[PDB]
């Protein structure tokens, strides 16, 4: 039921904190998730840091699902990496785009995977 | 203080139901809406469906707000415009692409201006 | 699969009480919140006698978007007024438990899609 | 306008006790939510005696971000242990209100950006 939970949480919030790596310097940003089952997907930019730092440093921490300081929340410590499959990307892209997609791609259009190693549920 | 809860619950919900007319038949779609003040701001594609109808029949009804049962919530009949403004569509599109964005742009991508006429909190 | 989807449909309606129910007058829409239930893909929904308006009975319903991460559906039919008093009471006994005691809309579904 | 940005972000720091405190071990990032007390843009937040850990100061914190129509603070600084007493005991009586009666991490901010 642990998983139920944690994908309950997973499947009503779409904003998370990003925490990657630049040598010895934190990095932390909002952004959106996508999941798929416990693997989770965020958009960026080929010349993005975000992406820079992933391809150098693939341990990153995400934080989710913080809603008010009563919400049981997740905390996720996963390894990352530019998401290689041409469908699984084109799929996130449309997702994404949905409200003006209209069959256009972008071509420093990237993809980051990441794909959980420790899943924690705080303040349950 | 009316302004003010309006404000509030446009500043807490992105996503809404617009709804638009193509001639005789309603079509609702769920879409993220920015605002500037009361004037709302919806993303679209030069050729999709909502941007035709639009263009055709100016007069849409949003609805926005609705969390659950108990909220209160926005329902805005206003009239809708495609924005012409290129700084304020390049504003529009940094915010939408913030995750990916890295400098291209989209020459499909357009914006639906929304100029209330009638809001109306529902449920307070 | 068209089990399948038809069994995909009942389940978002069996688990959703609350839809957006569109319609236009004119050349004007109109959306509202409504109470939805359904037999089968049929859906029902409670809600002047100086005033009439022109009929118009193409309407769009959303129902089942719960959070981003929700499959719905949008079902594009026809409205109409409900008279079977024996269907509106199944109604009330249903969205009015305490009560001791009134038009439907009949939604007859042309179209549905599951949304994602 | 060098003072309206400094009167933003005193505003946001004494609207919002939350944040995200983000840090690096080794090559390991880590992030935790705290409750952040301020003395201008000086940020102190309360946090084995058989371990130890090798001290990496850089830490980033995000402050403000209450809806998506939110405009917040990234805050990048050096964290340190606040030994001081008094100010210890000026964040309990501050962060315990009913109780009767503990670290102290002192942020000062090298960077801060308004994000929206």
């Given at each position: 039921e642990l998983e139920?939970?944690?994908?309950a949480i997973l499947e009503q919030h779409?904003?998370?904190?990003?925490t990657s790596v630049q040598g010895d310097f934190p990095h932390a940003r909002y952004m959106t998730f996508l999941h798929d089952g416990l693997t989770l997907y965020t958009?960026?930019?080929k010349e993005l840091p975000k992406?820079?730092?992933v391809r150098r440093?693939?341990?990153?921490?995400?934080?989710?699902?913080?809603?008010s300081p009563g919400s049981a929340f997740l905390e996720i410590n996963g390894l990352?990496?530019?998401e290689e499959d041409e469908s699984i990307k084109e799929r996130i892209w449309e997702n994404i785009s949905k409200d003006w997609f209209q069959?256009?791609?972008?071509?420093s259009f990237v993809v980051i995977k990441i794909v959980p190693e420790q899943i924690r549920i705080l303040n349950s």
């Open positions: 139920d939970k944690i994908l779409q904003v998370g904190v990003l958009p960026s930019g992406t820079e730092e440093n693939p341990h990153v921490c995400v934080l989710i699902g913080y809603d990352a990496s530019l069959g256009e791609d972008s071509p």
